[PDB]
Every structure is written in C-alpha cells, then in structure tokens.
Amino acid sequence: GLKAHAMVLEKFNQPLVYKEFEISDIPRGSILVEILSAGVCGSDVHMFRGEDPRVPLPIILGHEGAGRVVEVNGEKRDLNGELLKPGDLIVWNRGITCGECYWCKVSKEPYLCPNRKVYGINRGCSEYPHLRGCYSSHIVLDPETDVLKVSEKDDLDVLAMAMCSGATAYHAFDEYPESFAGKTVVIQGAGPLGLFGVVIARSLGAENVIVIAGSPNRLKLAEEIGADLTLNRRETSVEERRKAIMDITHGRGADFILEATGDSRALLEGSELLRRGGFYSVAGVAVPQDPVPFKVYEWLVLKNATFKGIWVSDTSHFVKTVSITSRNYQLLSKLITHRLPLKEANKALELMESREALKVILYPE
Amino acid sequence: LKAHAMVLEKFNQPLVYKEFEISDIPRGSILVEILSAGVCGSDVHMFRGEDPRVPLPIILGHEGAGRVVEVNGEKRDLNGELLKPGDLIVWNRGITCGECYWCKVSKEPYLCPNRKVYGINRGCSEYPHLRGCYSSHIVLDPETDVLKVSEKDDLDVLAMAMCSGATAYHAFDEYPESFAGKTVVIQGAGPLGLFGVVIARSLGAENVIVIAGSPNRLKLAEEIGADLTLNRRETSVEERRKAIMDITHGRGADFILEATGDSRALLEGSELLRRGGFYSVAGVAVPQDPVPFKVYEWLVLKNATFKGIWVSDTSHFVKTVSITSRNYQLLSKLITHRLPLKEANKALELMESREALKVILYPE
Amino acid sequence: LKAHAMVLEKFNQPLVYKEFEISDIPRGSILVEILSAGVCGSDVHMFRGEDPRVPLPIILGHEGAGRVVEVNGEKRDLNGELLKPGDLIVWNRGITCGECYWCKVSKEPYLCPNRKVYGINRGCSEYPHLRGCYSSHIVLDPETDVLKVSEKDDLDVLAMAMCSGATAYHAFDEYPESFAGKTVVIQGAGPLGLFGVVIARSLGAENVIVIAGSPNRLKLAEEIGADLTLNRRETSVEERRKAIMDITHGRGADFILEATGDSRALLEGSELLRRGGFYSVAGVAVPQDPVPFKVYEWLVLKNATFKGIWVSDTSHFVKTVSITSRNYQLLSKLITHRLPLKEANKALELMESREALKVILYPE
Amino acid sequence: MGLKAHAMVLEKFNQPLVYKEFEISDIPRGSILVEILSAGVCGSDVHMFRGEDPRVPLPIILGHEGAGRVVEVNGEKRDLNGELLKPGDLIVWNRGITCGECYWCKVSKEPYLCPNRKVYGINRGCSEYPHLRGCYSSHIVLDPETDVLKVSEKDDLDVLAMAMCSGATAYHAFDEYPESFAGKTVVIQGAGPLGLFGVVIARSLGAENVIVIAGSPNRLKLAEEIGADLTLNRRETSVEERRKAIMDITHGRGADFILEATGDSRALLEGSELLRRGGFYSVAGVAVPQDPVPFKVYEWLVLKNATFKGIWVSDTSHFVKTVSITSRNYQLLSKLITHRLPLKEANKALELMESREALKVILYPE
Numbered sequence A: 001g002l003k004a005h006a007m008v009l010e011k012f013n014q015p016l017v018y019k020e021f022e023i024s025d026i027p028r029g030s031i032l033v034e035i036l037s038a039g040v041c042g043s044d045v046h047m048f049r050g051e052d053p054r055v056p057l058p059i060i061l062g063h064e065g066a067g068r069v070v071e072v073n074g075e076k077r078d079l080n081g082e083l084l085k086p087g088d089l090i091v092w093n094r095g096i097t098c099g100e101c102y103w104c105k106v107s108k109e110p111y112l113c114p115n116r117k118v119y120g121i122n123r124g125c126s127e128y129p130h131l132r133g134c135y136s137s138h139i140v141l142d143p144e145t146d147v148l149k150v151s152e153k154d155d156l157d158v159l160a161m162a163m164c165s166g167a168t169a170y171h172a173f174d175e176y177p178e179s180f181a182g183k184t185v186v187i188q189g190a191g192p193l194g195l196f197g198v199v200i201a202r203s204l205g206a207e208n209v210i211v212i213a214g215s216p217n218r219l220k221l222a223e224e225i226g227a228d229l230t231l232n233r234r235e236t237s238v239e240e241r242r243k244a245i246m247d248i249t250h251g252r253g254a255d256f257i258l259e260a261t262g263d264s265r266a267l268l269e270g271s272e273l274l275r276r277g278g279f280y281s282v283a284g285v286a287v288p289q290d291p292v293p294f295k296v297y298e299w300l301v302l303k304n305a306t307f308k309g310i311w312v313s314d315t316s317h318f319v320k321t322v323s324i325t326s327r328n329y330q331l332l333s334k335l336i337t338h339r340l341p342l343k344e345a346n347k348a349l350e351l352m353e354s355r356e357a358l359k360v361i362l363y364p365e
Numbered sequence B, C: 001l002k003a004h005a006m007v008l009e010k011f012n013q014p015l016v017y018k019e020f021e022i023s024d025i026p027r028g029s030i031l032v033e034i035l036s037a038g039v040c041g042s043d044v045h046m047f048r049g050e051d052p053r054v055p056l057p058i059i060l061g062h063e064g065a066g067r068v069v070e071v072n073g074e075k076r077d078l079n080g081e082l083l084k085p086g087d088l089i090v091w092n093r094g095i096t097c098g099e100c101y102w103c104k105v106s107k108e109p110y111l112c113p114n115r116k117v118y119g120i121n122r123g124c125s126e127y128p129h130l131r132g133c134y135s136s137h138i139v140l141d142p143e144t145d146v147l148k149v150s151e152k153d154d155l156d157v158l159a160m161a162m163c164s165g166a167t168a169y170h171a172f173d174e175y176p177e178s179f180a181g182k183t184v185v186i187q188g189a190g191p192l193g194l195f196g197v198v199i200a201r202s203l204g205a206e207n208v209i210v211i212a213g214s215p216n217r218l219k220l221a222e223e224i225g226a227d228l229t230l231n232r233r234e235t236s237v238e239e240r241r242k243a244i245m246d247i248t249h250g251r252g253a254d255f256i257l258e259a260t261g262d263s264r265a266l267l268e269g270s271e272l273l274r275r276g277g278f279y280s281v282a283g284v285a286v287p288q289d290p291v292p293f294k295v296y297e298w299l300v301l302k303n304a305t306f307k308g309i310w311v312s313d314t315s316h317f318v319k320t321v322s323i324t325s326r327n328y329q330l331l332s333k334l335i336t337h338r339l340p341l342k343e344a345n346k347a348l349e350l351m352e353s354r355e356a357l358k359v360i361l362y363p364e
Numbered sequence D: 001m002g003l004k005a006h007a008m009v010l011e012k013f014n015q016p017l018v019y020k021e022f023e024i025s026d027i028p029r030g031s032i033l034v035e036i037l038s039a040g041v042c043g044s045d046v047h048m049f050r051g052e053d054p055r056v057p058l059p060i061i062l063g064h065e066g067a068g069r070v071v072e073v074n075g076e077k078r079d080l081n082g083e084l085l086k087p088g089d090l091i092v093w094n095r096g097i098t099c100g101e102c103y104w105c106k107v108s109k110e111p112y113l114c115p116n117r118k119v120y121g122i123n124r125g126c127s128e129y130p131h132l133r134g135c136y137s138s139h140i141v142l143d144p145e146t147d148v149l150k151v152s153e154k155d156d157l158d159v160l161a162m163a164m165c166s167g168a169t170a171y172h173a174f175d176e177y178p179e180s181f182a183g184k185t186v187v188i189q190g191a192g193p194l195g196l197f198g199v200v201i202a203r204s205l206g207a208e209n210v211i212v213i214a215g216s217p218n219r220l221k222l223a224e225e226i227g228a229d230l231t232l233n234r235r236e237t238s239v240e241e242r243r244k245a246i247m248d249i250t251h252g253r254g255a256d257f258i259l260e261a262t263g264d265s266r267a268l269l270e271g272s273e274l275l276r277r278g279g280f281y282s283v284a285g286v287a288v289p290q291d292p293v294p295f296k297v298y299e300w301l302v303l304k305n306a307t308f309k310g311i312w313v314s315d316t317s318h319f320v321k322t323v324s325i326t327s328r329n330y331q332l333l334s335k336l337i338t339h340r341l342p343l344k345e346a347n348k349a350l351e352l353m354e355s356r357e358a359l360k361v362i363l364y365p366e
Ligand SMILES: [Zn+2]
Pocket: A097, A098, A099, A100, A101, A102, A103, A104, A113, A114, A115
C-alpha cells in the first residue's frame, strides 16, 4: 500500500511530530490526493495553542491545499461535471455541509450549517483512513467534497492560500447589494484577508481602494497590488485618516468598509469613516473578544448603515475566488513570503505566529 | 383667509394660540385645511428643547391629513391626478433637494442632508408662516409629494401612519427576502412596534412576536395580529429566549425590529437572532450611552445583518398608506384621544405621561 | 406489508391496480402510508405519453401527504426533528444531486439536471417499487426533504399545494420588491392561478385581478381574495385593458402571472404590463408554436422583466407550506372531488375534462 | 454685447442642417451657459434627421452627447458631489431631465421611465429663446435641474461625450444583473459603441469570460483589442458552431449573461439558445418598432427559468458609474472614435455614421 507521512498535532502547545501512515484502501467514492501545496494559516497557530474548541486530538492540521489526484475509488465529478482521473490537478472546498438542514436547504446559507465538517480543523486523524488534513504528503477527500479541476497554468501555491483568506474576503464583498462601480472601499488590515480584499475590490470595479494598517511593509504590498492610498496608523492621527477619506469621497465617507484586522475595536474607527447609507462587512474578528462601546444612534440609526458579519465561505464563494485569483496570480504570489518543507511545519507556525511571515506554504518532500 | 395655530415660542413653555391672515400663497403652493393632526412622541422632545433642528418660533406637527383649499398653479399627486379644491389629501412631511448624491445617485432620499420637514425644521416666522399641522391650515410647497385619498379613508389613522407607520415600513422594506415562513420579533409596543405588527402580518410573516413591558399595549398587539406577546417585566430574558427558540426550532428569529427607543434593546435582541438573521434598528432616536457590543458572537459568528433605519421617503409613504388602508379598523385602536387643536398643550402632556398612546387634534 | 398502487404500464392504457409485497426497505429510507394524493393536470400529459421523462412502468403521483410507518435507521425533517412512526409529513417531490453547478454554485436546485422526482421520472419496476403517490404507501429515499405537520393541518390541501402552490410561490418569490401597494394580474384560474390569488394577498398586494374563461373558477377566485375577475367570453380585450388602467392610474399592472398554459397569453399580458413591470411566466408546460413577440414594445421601451419559472425547490416548499397553513379554509375550496385510489382513472378523466378543479385520492 | 453662438439646425427632415448664429444675453434662472468642447454624433441622430423619431420637434439643434466648459451660471449650481460650478470648470452632464414628481421618479425609483423626460438634442426644439438646447452648437444652455459632474483636464472629453449615451445604456444593462460578474461568462451581440462599451464594462465588473458575436471583422478586432476573450463572426460561422463555442467555454451550460446590442429583434432567436438555464438576458439594442419575432415561450423562458430584461436609456446613477468606469479606460475607449470633424461639417458626420464609414464621430466647434 501507499506510504504517506504527515505532521501530527498530538497535544496542544507541543510540537507537531512526524508520523507515517500506510494507506491500503480508501473508502468508497473517496479521492486520494497527493498534496502539492499546503497553506499555513494564522488560525493554525490558534488551533495549535489549544484555543479553538472544535479541534480534536490528535489531528493533522492544514485546511488550505492544492494537489494531484492519485486515485478515485469509484468515480467523482468536479463542480463543472468533469470526471476526475489520476494526475488531474485540483483544489477543493475545505468544508462539507450536510445538505439537509434549514441553512443548507431553506435559507441557502451553507456556511452556517451547524454540521459543517472541515479538513484540518474538526476532522482528527485517529480513525482510518487518518489523512484528514493538508500538513501531509496525502489527504483522503470524501466523495461529498466540492472539487474543481485546475491546470498547469495555475499557481497552486496562490490557490492554496486563496481558499481560506480569499474566499472569506470574497464572501465579504459578495454581500454588498450594488455594483462597486463608482464606489470608495476602505480596507482595515493588511494581512492576507485585507490584501485579497484589495485585489477583489479592484477586480469588481471599485473606483478608490484605501487600506489602513500599521505595518509599512504590508502597506507597500497593498499599493503594489492595487491600493490607491494607504494610511499607516502609526504615522497618522485618526483625524488625518478621516480627512483623507472625506477628501476622496467629497465629504460623504466610504461606501464599503471591510474589517480585516482581527480586532473588534476596528469598528470604532471604521464607523466614523462610513457614509450615511454605507455598508460595513466585518470579517476579521475570529475569536471572542471584549465587547466594544457601540453607539447605536450614531453608527447605525442616524447613518442608516448596514453592519454585516461574515462567517467563512461556501462553494459559490470558492469558485468565484478561484476565478478572480486566476486573473491575479503575479500580484497575489507576492503574499507568499516563505516556502518550507512539510517536515518544517513547526518553524512555519512560529513564522506565522511572530509575523515574520505574511504567508507560508509547505510542500511535501 | 384667517387661519389659527398653536405656536411654540419658547421651549418648555406652553404652545400659544395665534391668528394669521393668509392672502397670497407662494407660486405653486397648495393651501390645505387641516382635518387631522397627529401628536407624535417626538413633538414632546421638540417642545422640551431637546431637538437641535428646531427653530423658534415654530408651528409643530409633522403628521397631517386635510382638504385642498387652493392650488397656486397646478399640482399633481403621485398618481398623476391634478388636485382641485375639495380634494382630500395626505402628504409626505419631508421634501428632499433632488440634486445631491443620495437623492440622485444612491437613490436614498431619506438620507438627503437638505431634507425640509413640516413642523420640525420649518419655522413660522416668515410669511406664509403655516408650515406645521398644529394649525387650521398648512401651506404645502409645490415640491411636496401628495396623495389623494377619499371619503372612505380614515384620515385620523392616515395622519398617525405618516410617521411611525412609514418608518416601520422602511424597517421591513430593507429585508432582502419575502416574509413567507419567517418569524418576526418586535421589541416595543408603541406606535412604531404596533405598526410593525400590522406590516409584518400584511407582508406574510409566519409568526409575529412582541416583547414589551406594558400589558395594555401587549393586549393591543395581540388584537391587531401578534401571535405571542412576552412581557419583559414578568418574564426572564432566558424564558423569552426559550419561547422564541421553541417557535423557530432552536434557530432564533429571522427578523427583529428594534422599536423601543433604548439602545440596550440590542443586548437581548442579539441573542434572539438566528445565524444569518436580520436586525432592523429603528427605535433609538437620540444619542445614548454606547452599549457593550460582542462583535464576534453577535456579528461575525452569527453572519448577522444589523440595519439602522433613518426615517422614510416617498416610496415608503405610498406603501404605508396602502397597507394602512387595508387595516383601518385595527389601526384605529391606537388612537386613544382626539382633542380640539386649542387643547394641544394637554395632548403633549398625555403623550409625555403615556396616558395616551396616540392623540389626534382637529381644528375648531 | 402488502401495499397496493395504480400502475401506468403503457401510455394511454388505463392504470392497473397491483399489490406489492414489501419485506424491507433500503437503509435510511422512509416507508410512508399515503393519506392524500393529489391528481395534477400534468399527470394527464404523462398518462398520454406526452412527457418524455416518464419511464414505464410507473406509479404516478407527485403530490403526497402521509403518515410515517417506519424509518430504516433515522431521518430528520427540515427543522431537524427526528421522524417516528405515526408522524404526519409532507415532502418535496424532487431530490437534487447537491453536487452540480446549479445546486452548489448558482444555488438554483430546481435547475439541477439530475433532479429525481417521485411519480414522474422514477419507475416502479425495481424493488422497492413504490416511488409514486398513487399508492397506499411510498418509500422515500433518505435524501428526501421532509417536513412534519400536525393534526391541525389539512393534508388534502397540503398535497395539492406541493405542486401548483410551490410553483406559484416561486413565481412570486422572483419579484425583487415588496408587494405593498402593487397591482397583480393573474392569467388563468386553475390551481396555479388560484394559489396565485392567495399568495398575492398573503404577501400584501393592494389589488388582485384575475383574467380567465371559466365562470365557476372566476367565482372561486373572488371567494379566495380577488378584487376583480374578468371573463374573456364576457369582456373584450380592450374592456379588460381599460379596467386595469383605471385601477393602476393609467400605468398598467406591476406584476403579472401567466398561469394559463397557453403561450398566446403573453400577447394580452404584455399590453397590461406597466413600464418597469414584472411578468412571471409559469403556466406554459409543453413546447408550443412560437408566439409573435414585439421586442421593442414589450421589452425594451417597457424596460420590462419577463421571468420564466421552472418548478420549485425546498425553499419554495417550506414557504408554500407556511402560507397555505394560514389559508386552509379558502384553499380547501379548490378540492372539488375526493375519490378512492382505485378510481384513479376516473380522477384523471375528471382532471382532463375540467369537471374537477382538483381531485384528491385516498387509499382504501 | 451678448455672447455670439452658432449651431447646425435641423429645419426640415431629410434636408441639410443649416448654419445659424444666435446672440445669448439673459438665461433662465438657475441655468448654466456651457461652451461645447465635444459633441458626439449618435446613430440615432441619423434617424431623427430622417424624420423617423416621433419625439422630434422642428426646428431643433440635435446632439445629446456633450462635454464642455462652464461660461456662466445664473445663480448657483452644484455638481452631483456638491461642488459649486464656476466659469472655466469642465463638465459633463446627464442628457435627460426627469420631473422628480411622478410614480417612476418618486415611488418606483426608475427615473429613466419618467413619462415627462426632457432630453437635449431630442425633444427640446430650438425656436424659443434661449434656443441652444442641443450639442451641435458652440454653446448649450443647461437648466438648473440638469445633473452635472465636474471633470478635470486629465479626462478625455471626447470619450466622455460618447460614453454618455451608448455607455450609460450598456451600464444600465449590466447593473440590472442581480449577482456579481465573478466567475461569469458574458456574451455580447453587436460590436457598435453599445456592444463595445459592454466589453469594457463586463471586464471592469470582473466577468471571467467576455465573448462578442457580430458581422464585421474590423469591429471584432476592436472588441478583442479592448478586452474580449473571443469573437465570433456570425457571417462566417453557423448558429450551431457559435453555440458549441459558448458551450465549450461554459462546460456545456450556456452564457450566464447576454447583452443584445445589435438593434435587430431577430438577435433573440440566437441569444435565447446560448443562454444557460437560470441565465440573464439584457435587451438594450433594439431601438425602433420592428416585426415581431417567433418566440418559443416554453423552451426559452419557462424550461430555461430565464430572465429577459429590456433596458430603456439610463438615469443619473448609471451616468455617474459610467463616467467612473470610462475614466479608468480612456485609452481603450478612445479607439472607438474614428472621425473628428468640425461642427460646420455636421452633415458629413451624419453621412459617415449612416454609411457606417465611421464607428463614432465627434464634432468640435471652432
Ligand atoms: Zn446543513
């Protein structure tokens, strides 16, 4: 049978350990996939530290992958109806939803499925066939996985990264009920989520894209990938930033704001930048935090504002994200600062934790 | 023509009776005899000097129905009917500039920064003076959006509906799906929330639940269509959440209307809202202390929409009259007092004390 | 157990009564005792071999309500409730693949090319055989979308609603605004149009006008909420257009539903539609000769939306059940005949001749 | 003492436009006197010249596509962003003024459908002072109700003038689509200015694939140059070949979104067969009553669950968004301007547009 290896999380806050798995057969309808690129996410650090309550042990982490089909045990179609075969290059939606609940079937919001099963997050490696995350030479995909064939003209590293931060960013923009033509977009934060938001905002036809953050290196990147204006929170005052946005928008404020900071306190700045009638997509905050002092009359009622929380993404967002991403490979590849062998998965988590890396991608040896 | 009005000359001092002689009216204007004038809870705040838009002196009253006396030129209503002396009409209290970003580009006229409103930011010092409904007569500018009504319409109900009803309608109109199969929770049982009951019912909501503190208002909400009322003073937060969870199979409410006037209503409402739900916030009407808002739990993880609602526009006005017109007998139950115009000071006192739910004034 | 069903062996051959011995059912499947089975006009086309989807032999019947006999394993309804013996249920006739572009990307499961439908494209020759509602029992796959109902629900009405009702609902669901203040014109007064009357009313339409040729169906349309009916034998096309222009102040209808089954309906409907109006075309159910379409006048100059409507999905299912549940007394009037299952041929005959509006079959 | 202006006046249908001079002193309260710098010649100007548009009074100064420079404002005028206009400002404006009082303007919020819509160079004659109500002129007088946008010396006024008509109608067509264009396949029928602006708008909104079907190789080459992924020449392929091409690109589904930009009702016969189940078809090119086409209701509407949406002109929201898209694509869109003529050659301009020797002509005073 097949000799696979992976980096396994056995106990929280303890280094991932190398382990080998002999793969004999795979479940009916499943797809055995050779991982070619595996994204390391900020959230993987959180999971490693034992702060994500969905996470069983032991587990093969890694929810962002691109790979080559080794074997389908039976037949599997991709989302366009193409039958997969050995050697096909694919990406896939990390989440499988039930297809039977209120959100999957009635409201058509499958990202809200309470039964959502996610590779490298709530799928452990204890029970055979074990290989349920991307920090591995190989992953076994269930037959219910949403898959998309890609080609050798696709940058698999970029696609892997895009699966997570990109598709969330896409969801955030997709909730806006108008075209972006003529619109001013403000993005708070310049990690992968905010930076995909720059390229997504550009690609959907936004007039002006402004990014507010605190790292000059990340802000330079934002400019190289399409931002019209960047504002460094450490070099400018709140009022200076408000005036720059008010100047650009003829005194109205921004039409659409993306929170991509991870910090609930971002809404305090963002609310004062939003025009009357504007739309604030809140997608960065990823853990419970202290409550923020929210001014209901000023920020919601008087402003006639929409505040929209964004929870992950579904298959519609996945395919649309691949499509935008595929027009933007050269720019988006600039987000990958580090490329490491799988056996260095621990160092990769350190790099991400310390912010030495913007994004790290692992490759099996 | 000799008109009279009850005029606000000094905040916190009683409205005073005053006579006005109306000869010429401005070009294009419509002189209207007031038949019904609603006394709104916001008029109390204006009376008390709490509204910074309010010039003095001013004839208050932004909620009106009346009879056309004359048109200086020609005026069509929204359906294109030329107005003539004798016609009965209602009208939108607000006039927008029709030239700014919100009027012409984003098509959100309610957000017009140049919005002019009878009985609110239009004083009575300058001729022709009559720019509010606490008067025998009002002069409507040509730009006013008007609708003709008939003798089969209830003008008292229509006056009331103009304000609270049209804001309630705006709150429901922002919901991007139909209300079929949906559970609606309304927080509050003043005019705003009670209109919400009738609008929710009228748009097809499956369940309409009202949370408030007054048994008399809760009985009324039942009478006009609520499936369930929950008295906030006689139940726990946890009991009310359980009741809503039982009705929605453990999910929560699809749509919540905040109609209390208290920002703290979001603390409870946020925990009733299903994942993916929609919270329209329309009641809070003054700057208040900030509330501790749980961004992850209430917005992000919930994938929720919080939508603030500012007043209403002409599309909301027309839709509100249409709903109201199919519900006159239910909605007339909100009017607890009808007083002559000269007793306007008592009307304000009734509304302030909540001895009244809604007061209508009539001239003479 | 020994079930019985009425089987279609050859097109145009009378349905044959047959017994089926059921020993065990596939894993996760649900064995359901049929309590009400609706006979649809589309069953007549199937019976004659006009529907190219139809395998033979087949147990027809795609409108069903029933009582759970057994689940081989466990099955949750759409609200997550575990089904158990004795539960009353309704279900979506169609099961979609959950994997294709329509199911997963555009979220239009009604357009699934792999859609499997009880009594339509599921034959009865392979065990467990019972894949249609003209039967004492049906075996539902684990993938079926089910909803529990109660003894307070009218199951005869629910069976009917599953088809025509959910298609009507889809047609209204596509309209991008509220129905408040709107005038709705419905063409045709069979079950689709009649459900259209009730739905239009329930979503808050101001005026509902029905145009058809059957006096008795038009009387029923008034009994269930139409404001005006217009009979094509008794009125001219010009008289109809004037009546609709009078109600809409010269503009035309805001929303039209085609529910006649005839392509030529568009000729009249296009001239009743306001500029900017919305025309949902849901009745035409077979390929027909092309109609002469005036692209400039009816689409471009009118800035009109013509929207075709193909069946329905689980979202429309639940929402239809929800509106129907509030209108059982009105909608019961559509059921003109109830016949034992063994009389299924006569039921198809009644539906073909239009002596019935809707027939319900009951086992035993 | 007054301002000396001149224009090319249509006095009688099918007779040459005639040069005439005017002296402009007073203008109506609130009005803006504008020096024309660019005037687009539209294909519909030909039909109006010929006496085919029932809206057209005589005499009239044609030209509904314009950009220019503020000479004077009688009072005050703010552009749509709130900026006060002053003499010397460069502007563009919406050709159409709506009443702001009717059902469509106030209730349904569809001002393009206002029955009282007043359009420079179309239904506004030139015989009553101050006369200058069209762009085939040295100057135009804009009413206070006109929606205006200030532009800069870095904007291409020739491209903006053209964009005002064909471009805003194409924008309207795309704006009616209820989803994002991400991952979508767009087919455009026709490669005149309307269809060609469609290409740039489709690209700008993020469409994945943009395909153009037309009959002219030159125009199909232009469509490729401004961002089309594929062109199909309908004179050199069968309907079946074109459908196969679209089916191959869309994994056998059909187009997500089609724009009819041909002017021929018969285009729907092919487009309907290219549309996927659940697809959206904006019909914007057909501009005059035509014979009815044989429409297959079951196959093209019902079974397809298709949306067919007719597109009538545009409003100020479309205007502003068109100017924004256009402003990022000046160099591509300038490729559409094939001829620039002096105002006094307006008759030759119409000839060029009618013969189709020109794709788009711009007129310039002086
Ligand atoms: Zn689910």
